[PDB]
Design a binder for this molecule. Structure first.
Ligand SMILES: Nc1ncnc2c1ncn2[C@@H]1O[C@H](COP(=O)(O)OP(=O)(O)O)[C@@H](O)[C@H]1O
Ligand SMILES: Nc1ncnc2c1ncn2[C@@H]1O[C@H](COP(=O)(O)OP(=O)(O)O)[C@@H](O)[C@H]1O
Ligand SMILES: Nc1ncnc2c1ncn2[C@@H]1O[C@H](COP(=O)(O)OP(=O)(O)O)[C@@H](O)[C@H]1O
Ligand SMILES: Nc1ncnc2c1ncn2[C@@H]1O[C@H](COP(=O)(O)OP(=O)(O)O)[C@@H](O)[C@H]1O
Ligand SMILES: [Mg+2]
Ligand SMILES: [Mg+2]
Ligand SMILES: [Mg+2]
Ligand SMILES: [Mg+2]
Lengths: 100, 39, 191, 538, 541, 520
């Protein structure tokens, strides 16, 4: 009746699709934003420090505001892209307070 | 949390520096460029 | 495949008699004659059995030349000991030679003082263990930190003899293979 | 259910497990189908070593060719286990389980349960056991009919070898079996009858020797070759050197004391040789006419062989365990181990002892006994496979004829047993039986499966198997009304029925009994199994 | 006894084909495997539901707590799940509401039917059971209606319609987004004393223009549309003309060239001198006629040439490209003009009216605003969304698409009557079906009871997302229905929800009749297919 | 990186979902291996053998599952086999259902895995009460009822056709091992096999059965009254615990050393002949020189006998384990031996030792099996362990519970009735215990081919009104009371099934996460 020797079970999601349940993922998403937050922590204020970024194409780009710093760093994580979207939205609407 | 932890692409080639020791290499790197053209 | 070989390979002449009732006579007695001949060869090769305390002139006489043996390449391993009464490891290694001599009668165990061994030898390098075979030095061993040092045991010394090719791995005289009778008694009960 | 548990596994269930047991059964049946019968094909088996061994026995085919299927290994143990104790009926077990599975599988496809089908085989098997009591015939052994034993011997030998080997090897078995029967009526096959290999002129030159033949002879030239009257002596003591339990050095001090202690090696041996010389002094009369021979189970030192050679005593060393258990039966003497207590009563008797050698090997012949209680069958052969073919033929022939003397009954063969059970199971009233429900086809399945065996004999001859049973069926229809009890057969020479009573075709009793019992158990267990799987640590 | 015989039907279908039939255990393998994705739509259910981030293979990230948008991007290898996938898409394209109930009710019927198959009830009888239970469910929902609406014009009446739909997706924003959608529908519908005979409505009437930046409260309604485009030529007057006639041309403003390719042929130099002025006078004859009637705005779909743009700059005529063809006709609906691929001349009947056109930046980018006051509009509106992230504005668009899709679900049929929501009518159906199972003796009674148990997830899923105990508020809610007042009992979601009773009319939570009927039918048909199959045949990759 | 973990942590609800699915998968393998119409199972081990059986324990021994939750379910069969010896498949099939029914709640109604445990102990306490009430006592000395009690388990096996012989075979064997409280043990039950022969002539015979023959040919093959004497040391010359190392100086020493080797074996043989035994059974090997002078007195010498059989010979013949031969007396010599005889079988020789049959030490015996092949012997041998296991429970406990699922169905009805009066939070897991107890009759109806919908509905209607002994006939598939059906099982197997199944669920329900690949 069967076509062959054995029949391996189907994975519901595609092979290699990452997924997780519980409170661990939302903590990882929050910790991902805090990891991006720590880069812009000492930049805030008049006595703050600039950030030097060098992308894969080897073009130097120094900046103080968080609008173009986040544009240079191509963000993979969706939760960390939330800070990048509001920074460009704040840069597009007002133009101040992108780090705060 | 899993073993992969990625936020930006190509984390292996990108490496940060910080603290007083990070700024120390910058001024000392200028001495190598300055010392060549000092003579 | 190994189940057929374990009947003959993993049983000595004393253990081969256990299969007299189960296995065939011609199959068993054919191998017992083979193992009996091997036992007779070891008896003829047992020309030793106690520590050979030699003098420096005899050092050639009993060591290098002896290691040639019959020269049928009948080589003989000659373990030399550069003894020194002051050092702690030397008296430990001397005790191992006396114990190993009573068991391995085919291997020649040689001892000599280190002061009479090499011209002005460093005392810190003592004790020294040399292994000759067919006139060639197989192993120039240094002090026994490799073999545990002060905590050296008889089991560690017998393991070293297997590495240099002096004793076979599956020899029934080695303590690693010579399981106690109480060990085999428990295995048969729980089988 | 098994894939999420085990990451790697194989599972067949509810249709493939049934197809596997039937397909593997039909596959293994086709191998041994052609070998069954007298006109069957031979089968050689050559491994990677290159040796050759030729025989028609299904046990040799199964226990030499490695098999991977899980069904066939149970048929291999079943065919082997039935033959290992009985010595006959190997392929019959494979054909029954090979046919009963396919004959029941057609009804499993119809939708009948396997449980009630196997219930029909068991209650049908009990009917065959009741039928064996009425079908067998009593035979009294007091008559000592040698012609009856000759016909039984030709039943198995004609199947394995041709008529040229059967006619010359048949009376070799009959003369060996004629001495088995005695007043005690205790059968003894392994100790009494033996087989020995010997590369010689041809297989046709096999002869019968009433005494025990040995595969060794006299080492020294001066020792006598032929002896007219040789009184044997059994001694299990080892007359070479002994190493003596931890005993060590003969610490010698002077040079004269060295050889003085080396001479003590002879004193232990000479202490035992002197007892033989003291025994020879009692039987010293007629020394040129008579003789003396010593047979040892362990080795003899070559230094002591010269002692026997000077007194013209024949020496034989390193005998088997079985030969020491046979010298008392042949020569009539008694066995001895120690050299302390000797007597002339334990010495045997022999009328002729001679040796013949070929190449490097040498054989010792003993025969012309007064009242030999045992004997041997020295088989001659050309090649190694010729000995192996004669090994299986003599091994299966002695066991088949020996079972006739165990019981007081014998079963006629040539399909009479299977054809008789066919009419019995198909004509018996079912109300007498306790089976009801869907047991209608189970009686017909097992009854019809027995018919395939006697036509497999016809399939090797090339005739039409269905047409040569037409007159067989018509004969039994009139035989019941004619008031004449006769049993039909299947003669493959002309393609017509025959009578095994006058032709001499017979079969043992426990062969067909154990065959159906072993086959019904294996075939029933394979039908009830509905799932196959492999799992374990490796 | 080492290697198997390898299933001697291996001569049949290739190794890539996998059979997973029954008896072997297909039903047990399937109903279970899909429990993982059943919890996905269950957790994303209700006003307190959790949105799910789905990153496709291209990298376009989306975050939506629906079911149709999620399962479209999920590459699912399991075939039995895919029956539930496109069955949910049917709800999206047709009604645009209820994707979630479908993924939940269809999966729960398979989950709750574990008891029927495990006990040993026939699969054919289960299909007949749910079909007869489906018919009783459709007939019984008509009697529990108390929201028979006949006006369907005013804005306050839509508060019982749009706000329950918007309250599900992003519950925090109710009054603001409902004002945008309700004010959009009022601009879409025409001003008339009695508009009947099934007036036409389509989802393409209300469009969504996403602008980056700005709080959600600062949004506003625009009667026209807003394009991210750069005007050319001049600045507008913005109050001087008071009204502007807008011509929309399909073909570009240029000299009429043929489809077959040609070139310039000149036999002598006399034509060379006049060729420079001939092209200028050719367009001038066609361009001067357009300016006589006062067409203050021209829209050409294809690329406009520089020669045509130069003549229009001096007269002060607005130009616009609008390359896409779908959005070109929506601008015609605003002004009330027809497309004209012919140049011809402007006629008064075919030309529309537009009040004013003004240009500014809303989120930093310059855009063109077609807002008009006191003008006549017909089936056109837009909602300018202001938000902090593009990822959040994508969900607001689909929430508005589901909101206006419900308006299509109301006005297209003769009646889109309301029902009590918030876990009110679902528990009523459990009592109706429980009484219906005892009326018909037979072996199918077990299927009727288990069909009612599948409706239990609707109340408790709101309680599970609310952080409440299911074993307290759910059995307490049954005591409230003992006995109008008993029909308006529902599930409360608040810190004071220990009592478990909240009146529906205080906040006016309601659901549609046609949406639940189509959801129950597609859910039953989805469960009918999964329970009817026995063999599933795969293939390589 | 961090420690060897965090590959893919299955946490939350999905971890327990895999365990319920994994625990259910173990029962699905042997779902058809229950009832009288149960199917057999051939498992392929990787060494090269084969195991043909339907017992759930023997099936789960050979299988190997790479999952930690399913392995705890695997070990429950060893709990049942090494406690009673019957009902191993009943243990595995019931637990699966208990874990499965409790699952709905764990997955959906969110009852925490501890409240289910508290509900099950009260169900366990009530389960023993109703199982104690439903069971009726039975007389232990009634051989007519004992034969029907023993063949209850044989009916679910292949040898139901030979049940008339197996009950007589098992009853005689159990009474032999039974000691006059009434403690018995199967270590002396010899499982020696003989390939081939018919099952009808197979019979138990009082005594032992060796695989070896006599050494010397002149030994008596037929003795009327054997007198057995057990020896532990070998008859060879003992080298001793220390090296001898004899320094030989004179020529008259080496022949003396070889002569005392002959005199020491004479000294140990002559003192054995003080009592004049007929059969001398030595544990270790024997020498060729010593057997002759034991034959001069009339003894019989055998090869080396493993002491597992000598301990059986000590209880049969009444002899004692003796090593020191100098302390050999006449009191410790075995006696009252029935008969000695050696049969000829082509496999190996076989020496028979029969007993005179006429308190003291418990007597041993050897059960002869004459099957069709090797697998038939191993199949029948496990049936005797399953059949003889039933005979121990009736002696240790005179209670007798009804079979055919009537006992477990009685647990289902009382737990279902009492669940209504148990109002509270424990009501939902307490009511789910009855849902699994009604499955062990459901499996019988599925294997019989009937419809379990109307049969179980007819069962519950007649169980409250008709009687407490109602059950399903596995062969016919109709409702037949166990009193008229005449098949009964012990109550001890029902206790271990309910206890082991519920106690297994309490362990597995507490599992939160699964982390694989930590260390060895
Ligand atoms: N003269 C000032 N005195 C006190 N605080 C200041 C002054 N100038 C800037 N700040 C503070 O510094 C913070 C960071 O400003 P800055 O980083 O320069 O702007 P942005 O973050 O927009 O780039 C602001 O929140 C502001 O309150
Ligand atoms: N010459 C013959 N004529 C008729 N029948 C024969 C003859 N030789 C053998 N047979 C039949 O062949 C069958 C198989 O014989 P045998 O080879 O002894 O057993 P198996 O084939 O099982 O090894 C027997 O039943 C016997 O009746
Ligand atoms: N404030 C509230 N109080 C009570 N119930 C609410 C409230 N807001 C939303 N709900 C309920 O949440 C449910 C969400 O349903 P939803 O899945 O969005 O509907 P559909 O499946 O038709 O899209 C609605 O049925 C509604 O009754
Ligand atoms: N003839 C029968 N009819 C109905 N049920 C039976 C019958 N025999 C055994 N059973 C049921 O099968 C279960 C297991 O019995 P058995 O097969 O002897 O044990 P095991 O499961 O260890 O093989 C028992 O609980 C009993 O209720
Ligand atoms: Mg700033
Ligand atoms: Mg034959
Ligand atoms: Mg909605
Ligand atoms: Mg049982």
């Amino acid at each position: 009746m069967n076509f062959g020797s054995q029949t391996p079970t189907i994975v519901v999601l595609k092979e290699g699709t990452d997924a997780s349940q519980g409170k661990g993922q939302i903590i990882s998403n929050i910790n991902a934003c805090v990891a991006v937050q720590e880069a812009l922590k000492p930049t805030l204020g008049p006595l703050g420090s600039d950030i030097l970024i060098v992308t894969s194409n080897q073009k130097t780009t120094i900046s103080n505001d968080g609008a173009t710093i986040l544009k240079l760093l191509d963000v993979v994580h969706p939760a960390a892209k939330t800070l990048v979207d509001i920074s460009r939205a704040q840069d597009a609407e007002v133009g101040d307070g992108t780090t705060s | 949390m899993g073993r992969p932890f990625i936020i930006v692409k190509d984390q292996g080639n990108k490496k940060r520096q910080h603290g007083l020791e990070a700024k120390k290499s910058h001024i000392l790197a200028a001495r190598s460029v300055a010392s060549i053209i000092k003579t | 495949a190994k189940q057929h070989e374990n009947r003959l390979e993993d049983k000595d002449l004393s253990d081969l008699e256990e299969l007299e009732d189960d296995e065939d006579e011609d199959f068993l007695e054919a191998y017992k004659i083979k193992r009996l001949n091997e036992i007779r060869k070891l008896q003829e090769r047992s020309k030793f059995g106690e520590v050979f305390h030699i003098n420096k002139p005899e050092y050639n006489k009993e060591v290098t030349l002896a290691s040639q043996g019959k020269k049928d390449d009948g080589g003989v391993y000659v373990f030399v000991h550069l003894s020194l009464q002051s050092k702690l490891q030397s008296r430990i290694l001397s005790h191992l030679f006396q114990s190993a001599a009573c068991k391995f009668r085919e291997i020649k165990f040689v001892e000599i003082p280190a002061n009479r061994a090499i011209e002005n030898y460093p005392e810190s390098n003592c004790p020294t263990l040399i292994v000759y075979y067919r006139g060639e030095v197989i192993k120039n061993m240094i002090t026994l930190l490799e073999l545990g040092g002060n905590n050296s045991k008889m089991e560690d010394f017998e393991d070293f003899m297997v590495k240099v090719g002096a004793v076979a791995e599956g020899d029934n005289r080695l303590i690693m293979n010579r399981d106690d009778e109480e060990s085999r008694e428990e295995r048969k009960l729980h089988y | 259910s098994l894939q999420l548990l085990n990451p790697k596994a194989e599972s067949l269930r509810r249709d493939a497990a049934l197809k596997v047991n039937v397909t593997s059964a039909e596959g293994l049946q086709s191998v041994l189908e052609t070998n069954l019968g007298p006109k069957g094909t031979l089968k050689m088996l050559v491994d990677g070593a290159g040796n050759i061994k030729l025989t028609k026995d299904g046990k040799v085919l199964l226990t030499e060719m490695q098999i991977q299927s899980p069904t066939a290994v149970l048929i291999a143990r079943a065919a082997a286990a039935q033959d290992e104790i009985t010595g006959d009926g190997t392929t019959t077990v494979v054909c029954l389980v090979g046919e009963l599975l396919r004959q029941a599988h057609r009804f499993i496809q119809e939708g009948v349960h396997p449980r009630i089908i196997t219930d029909g085989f068991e209650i049908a098997r009990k009917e065959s056991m009741k039928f064996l009591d009425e079908f067998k015939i009593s035979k009294t052994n007091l008559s000592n009919d040698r012609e009856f034993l000759l016909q039984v011997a030709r039943s198995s030998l004609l199947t394995k070898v041709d008529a040229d080997l059967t006619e010359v090897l048949t009376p070799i078995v009959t003369d060996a079996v004629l001495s088995v029967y005695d007043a005690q009526a205790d059968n003894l096959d392994l100790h009494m009858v033996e087989i020995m290999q010997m590369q010689h002129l041809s297989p046709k030159d096999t002869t019968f020797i009433k005494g025990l033949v040995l595969d060794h002879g006299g080492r020294h030239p001066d020792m006598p070759t032929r002896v007219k009257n040789a009184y044997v002596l059994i001694l299990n003591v080892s007359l070479e050197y002994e190493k003596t339990e931890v005993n060590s050095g003969f610490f010698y001090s002077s040079a004269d004391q060295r050889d003085k202690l080396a001479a003590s090696e002879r004193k232990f041996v000479d202490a035992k040789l002197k007892k033989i010389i003291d025994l020879k002094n009692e039987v010293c009369g007629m020394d040129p006419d008579k003789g003396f021979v010593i047979i040892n189970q362990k080795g003899i030192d070559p230094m002591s062989l010269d002692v026997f050679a000077k007194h013209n005593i024949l020496a034989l060393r390193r005998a088997k365990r079985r030969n020491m258990e046979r010298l008392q039966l042949v020569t009539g003497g008694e066995a001895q181990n120690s050299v302390e207590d000797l007597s002339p009563q334990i010495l045997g008797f022999s009328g002729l002892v001679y040796q013949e050698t070929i190449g490097e090997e040498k054989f010792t012949y003993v025969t012309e006994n007064t009242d030999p209680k045992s004997c041997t069958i020295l088989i001659k052969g050309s090649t190694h496979y010729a000995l192996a073919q004669t090994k299986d033929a003599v091994r299966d022939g002695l066991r088949a004829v020996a079972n006739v003397l165990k019981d007081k009954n014998i079963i006629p063969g040539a399909g009479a047993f299977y054809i008789a059970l066919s009419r019995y199971l198909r004509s018996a009233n079912m109300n007498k039986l306790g089976a009801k429900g869907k047991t209608k086809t189970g009686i017909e399945a097992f009854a019809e499966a027995l018919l395939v065996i006697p036509k497999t004999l016809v399939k090797n001859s090339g005739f039409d198997p269905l047409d040569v049973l037409a007159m067989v069926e018509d004969e039994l229809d009139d035989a019941q009304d004619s008031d004449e009890t006769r049993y039909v057969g299947v003669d493959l020479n002309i393609g017509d029925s025959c009578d095994p009573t006058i032709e001499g075709i017979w079969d043992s009793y426990r062969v067909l009994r154990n065959a159906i019992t072993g086959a019904t158990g294996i075939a029933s267990n394979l039908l009830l199994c509905d799932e196959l799987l492999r799992a374990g640590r490796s | 006894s080492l290697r198997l015989p390898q299933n001697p039907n291996a001569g049949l279908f290739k190794q890539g084909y996998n059979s997973y039939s029954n008896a072997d255990g297909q039903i047990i393998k399937s109903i279970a495997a899909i429990r993982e994705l059943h919890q996905m739509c269950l957790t994303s259910m209700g006003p307190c539901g959790r949105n799910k981030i789905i990153v496709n293979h291209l990298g376009k990230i989306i975050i939506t707590n629906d079911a149709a948008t999620m399962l479209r991007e999920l590459d699912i290898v399991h075939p039995a799940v895919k029956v539930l996938v496109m069955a949910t898409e049917q709800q999206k394209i047709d009604m645009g509401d209820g994707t979630n109930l479908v993924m939940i009710l269809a999966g729960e019927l398979l989950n709750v039917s574990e008891k029927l198959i495990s006990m040993g009830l026939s699969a054919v009888e289960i299909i007949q059971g749910y079909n007869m239970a489906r018919k009783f469910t459709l007939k019984e929902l008509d009697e529990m209606v108390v929201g028979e609406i006949t006006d369907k014009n005013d804005k306050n009446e839509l508060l019982k319609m749009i706000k329950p739909v918007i309250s599900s997706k992003k519950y925090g924003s109710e009054d603001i987004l409902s004002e945008l959608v309700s004010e959009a529908v009022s601009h879409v519908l025409p001003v008339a004393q009695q508009a009947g005979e099934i007036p036409y409505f389509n989802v393409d009437s209300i469009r969504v223009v996403k602008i980056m930046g700005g709080s959600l409260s600062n949004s506003t309604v625009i009667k026209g549309m807003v394009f991210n485009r750069e005007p050319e030529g001049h600045v507008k007057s913005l109050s001087e003309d008071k009204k502007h006639k807008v011509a929309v041309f399909t073909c570009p403003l240029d000299i009429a060239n043929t489809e077959t390719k040609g070139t310039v042929l000149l036999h002598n130099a006399q034509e060379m001198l006049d060729f420079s002025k001939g092209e200028e006078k050719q367009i001038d004859a066609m361009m001067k006629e357009i300016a006589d009637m006062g067409v203050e705005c021209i829209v050409a779909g294809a690329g406009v040439g520089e020669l045509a743009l130069h003549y229009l700059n001096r007269y002060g005529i607005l130009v616009l490209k609008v390359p896409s063809k779908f959005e070109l006709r929506r601008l015609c609906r605003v002004c009330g003009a027809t497309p004209l691929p012919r140049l011809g001349a402007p006629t008064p009947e075919e030309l529309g009216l537009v009040e004013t056109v003004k240009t500014m930046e809303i989120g930093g980018d310059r855009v063109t605003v077609f807002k008009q006051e006191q003008g006549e509009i017909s089936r056109t509106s837009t909602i300018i969304l202001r938000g902090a992230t593009q990822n959040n504005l994508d969900d607001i668009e689909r929430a508005i698409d589901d909101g206006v899709a419900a308006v299509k679900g109301l006005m297209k049929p003769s009646g889109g009557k309301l029902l009590p929501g918030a876990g009110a009518t679902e528990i009523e159906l459990i009592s109706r079906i429980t009484k219906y199972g005892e009326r018909t003796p037979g072996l199918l009674q077990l299927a009727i009871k288990q069909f009612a148990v599948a409706f239990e997830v609707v109340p408790r899923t709101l309680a599970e997302t609310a952080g409440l105990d299911v074993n307290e508020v759910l059995p307490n809610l049954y005591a409230a229905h003992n006995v109008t007042d008993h029909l308006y009992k529902g599930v409360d979601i608040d810190g004071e929800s220990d009592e478990g009773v909240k009146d529906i009319r205080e906040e006016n939570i309601y659901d549609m009749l046609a949406t639940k009927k189509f959801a129950i039918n597609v859910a039953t048909e989805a469960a009918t297919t999964v329970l009817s199959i026995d063999q599933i045949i795969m293939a390589k990759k | 990186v961090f420690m060897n973990a965090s590959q893919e942590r299955t946490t939350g609800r999905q971890a327990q979902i895999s365990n319920i699915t994994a625990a259910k998968a173990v029962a699905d393998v042997i779902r058809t291996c229950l009832g009288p119409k149960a199917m057999l199972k051939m498992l392929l081990d990787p060494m090269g053998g084969l195991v043909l059986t339907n017992d759930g324990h023997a099936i789960l021994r050979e299988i190997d599952v790479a999952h930690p939750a399913a392995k705890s379910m695997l070990e429950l069969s060893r709990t049942q086999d090494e406690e009673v010896g019957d009902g191993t498949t009943t243990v595995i099939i019931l637990a699966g259902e208990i874990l499965a029914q409790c699952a709905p709640y764990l997955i959906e109604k969110n009852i925490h895995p501890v409240i289910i445990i508290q509900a099950l102990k009260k169900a366990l306490t009530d389960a023993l009460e109703v199982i104690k009430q439903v069971s009726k006592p039975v007389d232990v000395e009634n051989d007519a009822a004992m034969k029907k009690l023993i063949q209850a388990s044989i009916g679910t096996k292949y040898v139901i056709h030979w049940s008339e012989k197996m009950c007589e075979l098992a009853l005689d064997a159990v009474k032999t091992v039974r000691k006059d409280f009434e403690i018995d043990i199967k270590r002396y039950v010899r499982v020696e096999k003989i390939p081939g022969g018919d099952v009808l002539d197979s019979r138990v015979l009082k005594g032992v059965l060796l695989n070896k023959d006599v050494v010397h040919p002149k030994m008596s093959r037929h003795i009327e009254n054997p007198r057995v004497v057990l020896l532990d040391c070998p008859l060879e010359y003992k080298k001793g615990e220390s090296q001898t190392n004899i320094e030989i100086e004179k020529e008259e020493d080496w022949n003396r050393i070889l002569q005392i080797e002959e005199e020491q074996v004479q000294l140990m043989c002559e003192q054995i002949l003080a009592v004049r035994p007929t059969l001398v059974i030595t544990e270790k090997g024997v020498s060729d020189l010593a057997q002759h002078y034991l034959l001069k007195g009339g003894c019989s010498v055998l090869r080396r006998v493993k002491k597992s059989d000598n301990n059986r010979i000590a209880r049969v013949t009444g002899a004692t384990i003796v090593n020191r031969v100098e302390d050999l007396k006449e009191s410790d010599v075995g006696t009252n031996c029935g008969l000695f005889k050696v049969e000829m079988i082509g496999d190996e020789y076989f020496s028979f030792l029969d007993n005179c049959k006429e308190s003291g030490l418990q007597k041993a015996c050897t059960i002869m099996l004459r099957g069709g092949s090797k697998d038939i012997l191993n199949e029948i041998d496990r049936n005797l362990q399953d059949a003889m296991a039933v005979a121990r429970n009736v002696m240790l406990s005179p209670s007798l519970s009804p079979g055919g699922g009537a006992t477990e169905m009685a647990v289902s009805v009382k737990l279902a009735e009492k669940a209504k009066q148990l109002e509270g939070i424990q009501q939902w897991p307490y009511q789910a215990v009855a849902d699994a107890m009604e499955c062990i009759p459901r499996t019988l109806i599925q294997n019989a081919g009937g419809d379990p919908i109307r049969l179980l509905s007819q069962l519950r209607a007649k169980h409250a009104q008709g009687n407490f002994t109602t059950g399903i006939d596995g062969d016919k598939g109709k409702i037949v009371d166990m009193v008229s059906y005449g098949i009964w099982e012990p109550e001890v197997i029902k206790q271990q099934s309910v206890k082991t199944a519920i106690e297994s669920a309490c362990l597995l329900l507490r599992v939160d996460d699964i982390v694989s690949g930590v260390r060895k």
